[PDB]
Amino acid sequence: AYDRAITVFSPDGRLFQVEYAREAVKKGSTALGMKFANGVLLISDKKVRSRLIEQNSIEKIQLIDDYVAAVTSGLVADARVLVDFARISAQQEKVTYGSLVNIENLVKRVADQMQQYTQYGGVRPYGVSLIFAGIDQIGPRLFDCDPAGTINEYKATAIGSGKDAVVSFLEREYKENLPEKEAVTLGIKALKSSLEEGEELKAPEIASITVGNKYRIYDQEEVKKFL
Amino acid sequence: AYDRAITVFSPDGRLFQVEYAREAVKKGSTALGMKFANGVLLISDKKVRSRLIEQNSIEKIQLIDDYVAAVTSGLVADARVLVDFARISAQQEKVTYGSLVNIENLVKRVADQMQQYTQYGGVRPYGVSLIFAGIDQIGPRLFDCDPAGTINEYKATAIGSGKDAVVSFLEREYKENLPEKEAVTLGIKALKSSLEEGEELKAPEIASITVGNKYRIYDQEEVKKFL
Amino acid sequence: AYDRAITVFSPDGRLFQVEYAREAVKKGSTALGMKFANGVLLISDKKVRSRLIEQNSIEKIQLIDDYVAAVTSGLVADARVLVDFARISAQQEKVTYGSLVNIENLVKRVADQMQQYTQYGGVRPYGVSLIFAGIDQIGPRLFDCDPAGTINEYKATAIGSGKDAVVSFLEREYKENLPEKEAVTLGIKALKSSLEEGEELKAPEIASITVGNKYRIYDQEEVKKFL
Amino acid sequence: AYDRAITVFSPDGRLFQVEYAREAVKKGSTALGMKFANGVLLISDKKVRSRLIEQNSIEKIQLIDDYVAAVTSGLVADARVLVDFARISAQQEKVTYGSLVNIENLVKRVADQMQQYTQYGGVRPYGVSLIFAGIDQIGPRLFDCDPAGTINEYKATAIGSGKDAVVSFLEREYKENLPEKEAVTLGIKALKSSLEEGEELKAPEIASITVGNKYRIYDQEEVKKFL
Amino acid sequence: AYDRAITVFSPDGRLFQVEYAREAVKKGSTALGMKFANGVLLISDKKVRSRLIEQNSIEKIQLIDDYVAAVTSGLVADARVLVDFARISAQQEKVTYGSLVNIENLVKRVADQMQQYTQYGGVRPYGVSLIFAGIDQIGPRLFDCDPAGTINEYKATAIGSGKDAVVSFLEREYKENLPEKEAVTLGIKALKSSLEEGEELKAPEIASITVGNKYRIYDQEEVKKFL
Amino acid sequence: KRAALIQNLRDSYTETSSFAVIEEWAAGTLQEIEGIAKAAAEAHGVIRNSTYGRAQAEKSPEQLLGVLQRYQDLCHNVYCQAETIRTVIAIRIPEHKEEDNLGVAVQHAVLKIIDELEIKTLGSGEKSGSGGAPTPIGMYALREYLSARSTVEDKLLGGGSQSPSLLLELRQIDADFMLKVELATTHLSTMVRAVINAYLLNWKKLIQPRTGSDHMVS
Amino acid sequence: KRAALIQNLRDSYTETSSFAVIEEWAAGTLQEIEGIAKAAAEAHGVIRNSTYGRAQAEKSPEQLLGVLQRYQDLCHNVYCQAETIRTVIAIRIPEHKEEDNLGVAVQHAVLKIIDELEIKTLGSGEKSGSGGAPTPIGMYALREYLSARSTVEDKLLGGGSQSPSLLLELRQIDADFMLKVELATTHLSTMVRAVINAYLLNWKKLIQPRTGSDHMVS
Amino acid sequence: KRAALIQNLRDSYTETSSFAVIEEWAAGTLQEIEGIAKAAAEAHGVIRNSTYGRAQAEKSPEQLLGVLQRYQDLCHNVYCQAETIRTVIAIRIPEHKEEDNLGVAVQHAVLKIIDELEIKTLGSGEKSGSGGAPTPIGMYALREYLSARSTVEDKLLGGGSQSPSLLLELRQIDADFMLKVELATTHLSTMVRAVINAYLLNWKKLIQPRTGSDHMVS
Amino acid sequence: KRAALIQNLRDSYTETSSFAVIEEWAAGTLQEIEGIAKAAAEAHGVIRNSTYGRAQAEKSPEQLLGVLQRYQDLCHNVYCQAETIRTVIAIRIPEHKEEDNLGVAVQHAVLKIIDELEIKTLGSGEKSGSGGAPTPIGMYALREYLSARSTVEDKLLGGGSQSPSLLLELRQIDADFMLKVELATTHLSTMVRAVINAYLLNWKKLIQPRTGSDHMVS
């Protein structure tokens, strides 16, 4: 009765279509971010299918600009559209003021676009969660954003199928101000804890950035050293 | 039959969708406002959860301008969008006339935006309540505003899950024209009365303004002195 | 079922959604108007709900301009939007012609806006009735206007929950050309007769206007004399 | 299941929503028109009904211009809108050509507007019938117009609850070319025959016009002479 | 209940209409693509009808420009529209920048067009998959694109009814850097293995491109040499 | 004349008639049911503390016969009173339409609870439907008691049955009919209380299911 | 005064009346029911270990009668206690409307499980619906047992019957009736537990099904 | 205290109680069923290979009684174990709402299969519905067999009846009751297997039918 | 472990088990049915060309018993083979959802045709539904025949009856029971043929009702 249309409140005040969109996100691959000493990092898993697939066109961590990266989970095509929105929206701010002072405003514009898709008939929500990570004038930043357009700022966090496991691990194991190498190590352990019976984890994507610098994407061979 | 669309009156003249939107508001964290001698204050509870969260952002109390602040309860993304609207609307008035003479008109502009989302098909109401508090050419002001765009002006008031506990407490304990310190103390006591018993209060947001000054947000330290 | 959409006639030629809107109007606080010798007045009962409420505010009686006032019953935010419409529409006439010659044309513009919201899919009616009272180039005027956009001119009338008790009292007790003080007395008495079994009038709002003058709004200790 | 939407034909080729709008028209007060020697008149039953009501305004007979009048039956606010439309449409023709040569064309523009509201989704028909009467280049004219946009030209006719009685009386008793006073008498008689047994006709509205003159409304006393 | 509209998430977070659009794709004729040494090829199973059809006229392989070709499966009319879109979108990019540097961006614009058609009500998804193959400033490229606007880059892949057989065959047989002739042979081999009950592959369409050259479409005669 | 005929119907059975039933049910009727419940428990207690011989087959116990007679008289009065309320509503069902049926649905909902009271709770029909007989005992409990006891008496009296369970059964019939009265009175009180609340909450739409003048039209 | 009549009903059957029943059921009742289940399993073991002769037809087994009596007494109490809860809810069903019926839906949902307890689980009616009688044995267990056993006793005592299966049947009636009690107590425990949960989770809307006041209007 | 009453209920009957039933059913219970099926197939062979005289009316065959007894004991245990599962789910049906009922529908679907097991498959009720009795033979098979054999034994033993078909009918009651146990054990196997699968696919929603996330709210 | 319990169930009853049944039904089963149909046809011709005296009331015809016996054995096999197919499907009904149920609807539609086969066509239930018993004769036809003829035998033999029509009725019972086997074999053949078609057209969804070809997601 109350869960067929985005514009319909249930008697308890719930928006069921938006809750169902959050189920699409639970099915995506696991990714996490965490702040460390003068920096922030992102790590993405992903199930590669065939050996006939091209790796490198592999598309999980997406730069928004030199100082800001995102990872997503949920419907992939929805996620690409929101990533294009974020990139163009960051450039509009940069052209207007000459720079992006506070990453939080970028995340809000994206979240506002996703909120609108929970308020107008004729449209479905984006079935996507994002993590944004980078440096602005405040310092290293880490945010998540969900299908409702709800945002939180984090010291560490995760999205996708293994979210709960990863969040639990970091809940017990996370410490602030780790050197980058320790952060990546902890991240990899948190990601591994989320796997079943016997999986071991193939090479994930890793990206980091520290104050005064631009993003670096660890390449295949750098990541191997952590496995 | 009658509770599936905002454009549909029930036989008793009710708009059930708007009443269901009010149920979302009741799930939010308790916040209150009260007038004291030559000023007004806001207190916001926050059930802050995980240590992986950055506690120092996504605040419940939002400055609209230097003389006006709001606190919201209900759907968080909706609330953000209504706060963005209030800030821009305040500035539009300042540009037009050079100042904001009466905060009541800003509140009516926000409430009219909410009213319109209860009258046109293809849209859902905002699942939000706000309190506005500030100083204008009339004096210290305190208003609330609900999903229907209904407003009232108050000496003291509350929103969120503990609204009723807080309000019944203030009905008997509230006095007009207390000094700031005594008003905050009463406010803090009002909020504790709404708690679950054995359950304690983990440092609210507090902000205040007195005639002739701009808003001050109480720092994390100054709030503790009241606990 | 013929009662779910505003654009649907029943087999008997009725618009049930419009009839349901007029149920919302039956739940508001009682107000009344009456013409007296060279004038007209309005009186409104206010459902006061708590000592924490600022009572000087959100008046039931609203001036539309210096010579015309209204009082509303029903959906409060809908009514506020219609009072805004009336105010701007009054000003447009005054700009166009230099003055507002006949208050009936203002009321008809308001009623026409309401009639529109009973004819087009995707909107609901306003859940509001108004009384308009003032002085124009014809003399003292008293009109009401309902959710359908139906208007009538009166000598005395009432709206809101006590409408039926007030109107029956006036039917037998009303006389034309009372001096102002006697009109008010009768008005107060008419209002008192609508109250249930040992209830008490908590000082209503009163406003009046006479030929050659602007409206006057009775203050607290002025209304006090009549109670 | 073919009677819920104006854009849906029944298997027999009927538009039930349009037939339901007619039902509204049958509920109004009886009015009639007749052609007489070099003129046409209208009489309207005034179902006044309360001493607190001004017996002066919101009349049934409305002048469209100095040479054309209408009387309506059915939804009152709808009727006012159609009368406003007719008045504006008469002026548009007069500005364009300098005069209004054939009243049928005015009635057709009014009827086309009604017809449009029986063909497009998202609108309901007008719940109104009109009689138009006046003098144009062709002579005295008398038209009716229903919710479907159907028009007919008449020597005599009626609308409202007593339509059927009045028309029966006139089909028996009507004679062309009566002098004014006998036409009015016949019309009054025609209208008395429509009342439920032992119920007294209070003063109707009466208006007439003759070739070479403008309309006149019969004052309250001149009508009485016929009662 | 949840599979009737593209704008409705099922409780598990699924979009059943999009899944049903894939099903149309599965009914189409098998096509495949593969990267070889400095090159890329496409092969398409034609699929017959009478000797009365002009052979070589409604090709399954379509040039997007001299350097990029596509093949489709699913609804044929939808497919034509998407190919026309891809052709115009490539020329727009060539006019803007002088050349098409990275084919992935063209595939993204096509995939974003398809994604839009899964998010807005009043629209159905394209019942189409596509393989794009060509050479850009990065090297030989192969992508697929489904009704959701989901894209992947590949070394080899297939679409249409015989997809799983073809992909299964390639998953064991496929070798990285084959010469054109041997790549083509492997392709036909893989295509044959998807036919059931000793079914005979009549002449398929073949196209290839190698770095520094334009596309070549094999003549019917040149394909036979491989049959 | 038709309006006079309707007026005569309605004046004969007004809101006052059905109100008077409700007042009676809320006071005297519930007390009487409580009185019967007590007498049944007392009689049941006496039987449970009894050993039965063949002498118990030779007299029919007057005390139980009296509890059952008293139950039946009460059921009789409730059925006839329920019929008054039912008349009052039924003669006010308005013209059949496909609209303006909100008060009419109140009328049908109250009628259907009275039907339940009369048909199910009081077991007044000569044949129960596909939904069985859910009341512990009905209007003709005395006849069903005598009919049951009699079959057993005949078997036990002339040479009688030597079946030990048959003798215990005669005692069980006596005990069970008292039990059934205790259960039926409790169940009846629930139903009476339910009707009292439903009537008093809904009585206005029961009398006037359609209201209002037509203000939209002139 | 109509409000006083309603207020009198509701003051005499309050949320405390139905809560007290639920407290009683959670503790003592479930434990008494388990007790009867054990008593019947015990009595059942004894019958399984018995060779029957003619002497078993000349006397009705007091141990089985005692178990059946205990079960009937429990069913009686539970039925009466169930009616208290029905009364509490039924006198709070509000004005009939086509809207604001979410708490009304709770009332009817819980009334329906209680009816099932009373009608199906306890088998308290005189006749079962066309849905039959899904409980292994009902309220009138003793009567049912005595009636079945007397028939077989008569045939055996007469010359009495030569049939070997008929003597075995006497024993099987004894055994199956203890078995039916074991099954019915188990089944009744589930139902009693389901009601406790349904009451305690839903009790607020049972008492206060509508939460009034107009916040959108004045 | 209400939450404590709920918690005490739910601690007594947890996922472990119902899982244990299911583990038992997947192993010991299905093995016992095949066992009973084989014993009945064997008794049916013996009967098929037999000519009947009035001496077969003079004794009740001990081997058949043992198959029927064993079948009843098994049905009895399955019933009691099914009710443990019903209890576990039923005390966890959550607050009645018009929303967030996806897991609640899982609970009702599984309760329905269990009701079918208890009511239709095991024929545990006193009376079948209008839907009939679709299991080849129910819980009280032994009493069913004894009554049917008893009737014919009477007619044959008297002078005894001289009908030749009556004599064959005595053999046919013996054979059919064995056939019915063979058919019924196959039928019960399928149902026990259906419920094992249903339970283990759905247990999570059976225990936590609502999962009430964080939210879009503050 | 729960996954293991499900895999064991499913490995013991695979698509092979149900396919073997359908292969048996398409060949051996349909031919056995036709043989019974012929045997019954010929036995019917014998009775049609017969004059009955009380000699035919003194013996029960062995040719008829054999045909009825052969029918029962056949029904027995079909039933148990139908249970195999139901097992294979029912242990593959997946997690209860409000979505992704197209194959689940296949499973239920084929389960329903199998039930009609078992319940209506074979008349295997002890009591038929309110829909009746539309099959000409059921699984317990022999018992049915013996009871019917046996009744008429005792009337004819005695002090036997002088009624001429009762003598013809003995004949008609014999004729009619052979006719019922001719009709029932025919009816059963159609049903077996409808299930072979239904199974072979739908077996993929019966085994794998949901095909998790996922995609769309991260």
**3-class secondary structure per residue, G2-23:** HHHHHHHHHHHCCHHHHHHHHH
I96 interfaces chain H, CB cutoff of 8 Å = yes
Q: Is the dihedral of CA D97, D103, D105, D107 positive or negative?
A: positive
User: Do H56 and G164 meet the contact criterion of CB atoms below 8 Å apart?
Assistant: no
- Distance between CA atoms of A70 and A111, rounded to whole angstroms? 13
- Distance between CA atoms of B76 and F201, rounded to whole angstroms? 42
- Distance between CA atoms of E104 and E106, rounded to whole angstroms? 5
Q: Is the dihedral of CA B88, B115, B166, C28 positive or negative?
A: positive
Q: Is the dihedral of CA A126, A129, A134, A138 positive or negative?
A: positive
- Chains B+G touching (3+ CB pairs under 8 Å): yes
Q: Which two tokens stand for residue A13?
A: 């005040």
DSSP state of B105: H
Residues 6 or more apart whose CB falls under 8 angstroms from that of G131 comprise G120, H129, H130
**Contact flag A122-E118 (C-beta cutoff 8 Å):** no
G215 interfaces chain B, CB cutoff of 8 Å = yes
Of the candidates B135, B68, B151, the residue with the CA atom closest to the CA atom of residue B143:
B151
- Distance between CA atoms of F18 and F85, rounded to whole angstroms? 5
Of the candidates D71, D73, D76, the residue with the CA atom closest to the CA atom of residue D33:
D71
Task: Tell me which amino acid residue G29 is.
Answer: T
Return the CA Rg of chain H.
Answer: 23
For chain A, give the number of residues. 227
Sheet containing A128-135: order of strands: A61-65, A68-74, A128-135, A140-145, A151-153
Q: Which residues of C touch D51 (CB under 8 A)?
A: 155, 171
Look at phi and psi of residue I160 and say left if phi exceeds 0, alpha if psi is from -120 to 50, else beta: beta
Q: Which residues of H touch I91 (CB under 8 A)?
A: 193-194, 196-197
Q: Which residues of G touch H59 (CB under 8 A)?
A: 164
Residue of chain F whose alpha carbon sits nearest to that of D80: F218
- Chains H+D touching (3+ CB pairs under 8 Å): no
Residue of chain C whose alpha carbon sits nearest to that of D28: C13
Q: Which residues of D touch C12 (CB under 8 A)?
A: 20, 23
**Contact flag H127-G130 (C-beta cutoff 8 Å):** no
Return the CA Rg of chain E.
Answer: 18
User: Do F178 and F44 meet the contact criterion of CB atoms below 8 Å apart?
Assistant: yes
- Distance between CA atoms of G12 and E66, rounded to whole angstroms? 91
Helix locations, chain A, DSSP H: 16-25, 76-97, 103-116, 163-173, 180-193, 220-224
Of the candidates C77, G100, C73, the residue with the CA atom closest to the CA atom of residue B148:
C77
Beta bridge partners of C140: C135
Phi, psi for residue E62 in degrees, rounded to 5: -125, 130
User: Do B51 and B102 meet the contact criterion of CB atoms below 8 Å apart?
Assistant: no
Q: Which residues of B touch C58 (CB under 8 A)?
A: 151-153
User: Do B147 and B38 meet the contact criterion of CB atoms below 8 Å apart?
Assistant: no
User: Do D33 and C22 meet the contact criterion of CB atoms below 8 Å apart?
Assistant: no
Cβ-count burial F201-212 (b if 16+ within 10 Å, e if not): bbbebbbebeee
Q: Is the dihedral of CA B47, B51, B55, B58 positive or negative?
A: negative
Q: Which two tokens stand for residue E115?
A: 């994604």
Torsion angle of the four alpha carbons H153, H157, H161, H166, in this order, in degrees rounded to the nearest 10: 30
Helix locations, G91-125, DSSP H: 102-116
Q: Which two tokens stand for residue D134?
A: 């006046």
User: Do A48 and A210 meet the contact criterion of CB atoms below 8 Å apart?
Assistant: no
**Contact flag D53-C154 (C-beta cutoff 8 Å):** yes
Of the candidates A218, A164, A199, the residue with the CA atom closest to the CA atom of residue A42:
A218
Q: Which residues of G touch B2 (CB under 8 A)?
A: 98-99
Identify which of D51, D124, D125 has the shortest CB distance to residue C171: D51
Q: How far is CA I174 from CA F206, H136, H162, I65, I166, in A?
A: 66, 26, 19, 10, 13
- Distance between CA atoms of C105 and D215, rounded to whole angstroms? 23
Place of tokens 């310092």: A139
H14 interfaces chain G, CB cutoff of 8 Å = no
User: Do E216 and E69 meet the contact criterion of CB atoms below 8 Å apart?
Assistant: no
Q: Is the dihedral of CA E165, E167, E172, E175 positive or negative?
A: positive
- Distance between CA atoms of C96 and E166, rounded to whole angstroms? 78
User: Do G135 and H115 meet the contact criterion of CB atoms below 8 Å apart?
Assistant: no
Q: How far is CA C2 from CA B217, D127, E106, H53, in A?
A: 55, 16, 52, 78
Burial class (CB in 10 A: 0-12, 13-18, 19+), C210: middle
- Distance between CA atoms of D189 and B62, rounded to whole angstroms? 75
Residues 6 or more apart whose CB falls under 8 angstroms from that of E184 comprise E41, E43, E206, E208, E226
H209 interfaces chain I, CB cutoff of 8 Å = no
H109 interfaces chain G, CB cutoff of 8 Å = no
Phi, psi for residue H213 in degrees, rounded to 5: -40, -175
Burial class (CB in 10 A: 0-12, 13-18, 19+), E196: exposed
F218 interfaces chain D, CB cutoff of 8 Å = yes
- A 10 A CB-CB count for I2 gives 14
Residue of chain G whose alpha carbon sits nearest to that of B151: G216
**Contact flag D50-C171 (C-beta cutoff 8 Å):** yes
Q: Is the dihedral of CA I56, I57, I59, I65 positive or negative?
A: positive
- Distance between CA atoms of H4 and G27, rounded to whole angstroms? 12
Q: What DSSP element (H or E) covers E78?
A: helix E76-97
Q: Which two tokens stand for residue H35?
A: 């066992």
Return the CA Rg of chain A.
Answer: 18
User: Do E30 and E45 meet the contact criterion of CB atoms below 8 Å apart?
Assistant: yes
CA of H217 vs chain B CAs: smallest distance (Å): 4
CATH 3.30.43.10 applies to domain H1-208: no
Q: Is the dihedral of CA E14, E15, E17, E21 positive or negative?
A: negative
Identify which of E1, E3, E18 has the shortest CB distance to residue I216: E18
Pairing of strands E128-135, E156-159: unpaired
For chain G, give the number of residues. 218
Of the candidates I123, G146, G173, G185, the residue with the CA atom closest to the CA atom of residue H142:
G173
Task: Tell me which amino acid residue F132 is.
Answer: G
SS3 A130: strand
Q: How far is CA E183 from CA E220, G138, H134, in A?
A: 18, 81, 65
For chain C, give the number of residues. 227
Of the candidates I139, I127, I136, I118, the residue with the CA atom closest to the CA atom of residue I69:
I139
- Distance between CA atoms of G27 and G24, rounded to whole angstroms? 5
**Contact flag C47-G218 (C-beta cutoff 8 Å):** yes
Task: Tell me which amino acid residue F63 is.
Answer: Q
**Contact flag H83-G162 (C-beta cutoff 8 Å):** no
Cβ-count burial H22-58 (b if 16+ within 10 Å, e if not): beebbeebbebbeebbebbeebbeebeeeebeeebbe
Beta bridge partners of C154: D53
- Chains A+B touching (3+ CB pairs under 8 Å): yes
CA atoms within 13 A on the CB side of A192: 13
Range(s) of the domain holding residue B115: 1-227
State the DSSP string of I186-204: HHHHHHHHHHHHHHHHHHH
- A 10 A CB-CB count for B3 gives 24
CA atoms within 13 A on the CB side of D199: 9
Q: Which two tokens stand for residue C67?
A: 């010579």
Look at phi and psi of residue D50 and say left if phi exceeds 0, alpha if psi is from -120 to 50, else beta: left
User: Do D101 and D187 meet the contact criterion of CB atoms below 8 Å apart?
Assistant: no
Q: Which residues of H touch B126 (CB under 8 A)?
A: none
Q: Which two tokens stand for residue A28?
A: 């995506």
SS3 C120: strand
CA of I102 vs chain A CAs: smallest distance (Å): 20
**Contact flag B28-H217 (C-beta cutoff 8 Å):** yes
Cα G37 vs. chain centroid, distance in angstroms? 14
**Contact flag H100-A14 (C-beta cutoff 8 Å):** yes
- Distance between CA atoms of E26 and E140, rounded to whole angstroms? 27
- Distance between CA atoms of C177 and I57, rounded to whole angstroms? 115
Q: Which two tokens stand for residue H15?
A: 């996922």
Residue of chain D whose alpha carbon sits nearest to that of F214: D27
DSSP state of F205: H
Q: What angle do CA C32, C37, C43 make, to 5 degrees?
A: 20
Pairing of strands C61-65, B61-65: unpaired
Q: Which two tokens stand for residue D136?
A: 């144009």
- Distance between CA atoms of A14 and I195, rounded to whole angstroms? 47
- Distance between CA atoms of A37 and A183, rounded to whole angstroms? 9
User: Do A32 and A190 meet the contact criterion of CB atoms below 8 Å apart?
Assistant: yes
Cβ-count burial H170-208 (b if 16+ within 10 Å, e if not): bbbbbbbbbbbbbbbbbbbbbbbbbbbbbbbbbbebbbe
- A 10 A CB-CB count for F61 gives 17
Q: Which two tokens stand for residue G68?
A: 């059946």
Cα F136 vs. chain centroid, distance in angstroms? 11
State the DSSP string of D78-126: HHHHHHHHHHHHHHHHHHHHSS---HHHHHHHHHHHHHHTTTSTTBPPP
Phi, psi for residue B100 in degrees, rounded to 5: -105, 100
Size of interface G-H (CB pairs under 8 A): 134
User: Do A31 and A70 meet the contact criterion of CB atoms below 8 Å apart?
Assistant: no
DSSP state of C154: B
Q: Where are the domains of chain I?
A: 1-208
Residues 6 or more apart whose CB falls under 8 angstroms from that of C82 comprise C72, C110, C113, C114, C126, C128, C130
Resolution in A: 2.3
Q: Which two tokens stand for residue H193?
A: 């297997």
**Contact flag H183-I9 (C-beta cutoff 8 Å):** no
Q: Is the dihedral of CA H175, H176, H179, H180 positive or negative?
A: negative
H98 interfaces chain A, CB cutoff of 8 Å = yes
**Contact flag C77-B115 (C-beta cutoff 8 Å):** yes
Q: How far is CA F52 from CA A157, F49, F171, G58, H169, in A?
A: 82, 10, 7, 16, 43
State the DSSP string of H32-44: HHHHHHHHHHHHH
Place of tokens 């079945």: G148
**Contact flag A13-B25 (C-beta cutoff 8 Å):** yes
Place of tokens 């994002």: A130
Pairing of strands A61-65, A39-44: unpaired
DSSP state of C81: H
Beta bridge partners of D153: D143
CA atoms within 13 A on the CB side of D77: 26
Pairing of strands B156-159, B61-65: unpaired
Beta bridge partners of I58: none
Taking only residues 29 to 88 of chain H, the set having a beta carbon closer than 8 angstroms to any beta carbon of chain I reads none
Of the candidates E100, E67, E102, E70, the residue with the CA atom closest to the CA atom of residue E86:
E70
**Contact flag C74-G214 (C-beta cutoff 8 Å):** no
Pairing of strands D61-65, D68-74: antiparallel
Q: Choosing among G143, G177, G206, which should be mutated to test the F contact, i.e. which has the most F CBs within 10 A?
A: G143
State the DSSP string of I69-105: HHHHHHHHHHHHHHHHHHHHHHTT-----SSS-HHHH
Identify which of B2, B11, B18 has the shortest CB distance to residue G216: B18
Taking only residues 126 to 165 of chain G, the set having a beta carbon closer than 8 angstroms to any beta carbon of chain F reads 126-130, 139-140, 142-143, 145-147, 149-150, 153-154, 157
- Distance between CA atoms of F112 and F130, rounded to whole angstroms? 17
User: Do F180 and F68 meet the contact criterion of CB atoms below 8 Å apart?
Assistant: no
Q: Which two tokens stand for residue H32?
A: 């016992």
Q: Which residues of A touch B6 (CB under 8 A)?
A: 7
Pairing of strands B216-217, E61-65: unpaired
Q: Which residues of A touch B24 (CB under 8 A)?
A: 9, 13-14
Look at phi and psi of residue H212 and say left if phi exceeds 0, alpha if psi is from -120 to 50, else beta: left
- Distance between CA atoms of D13 and D220, rounded to whole angstroms? 48
CA atoms within 13 A on the CB side of G184: 31
**Contact flag B53-A152 (C-beta cutoff 8 Å):** yes
- A 10 A CB-CB count for B130 gives 28
- Distance between CA atoms of B112 and C88, rounded to whole angstroms? 15
Place of tokens 């004679």: D175
**Contact flag G99-B148 (C-beta cutoff 8 Å):** no
User: Do H24 and H85 meet the contact criterion of CB atoms below 8 Å apart?
Assistant: no
Identify which of C2, C22, C148 has the shortest CB distance to residue F99: C2
- Distance between CA atoms of E119 and A124, rounded to whole angstroms? 6
CA atoms within 13 A on the CB side of B131: 29
G19 interfaces chain F, CB cutoff of 8 Å = no
Return the CA Rg of chain I.
Answer: 23
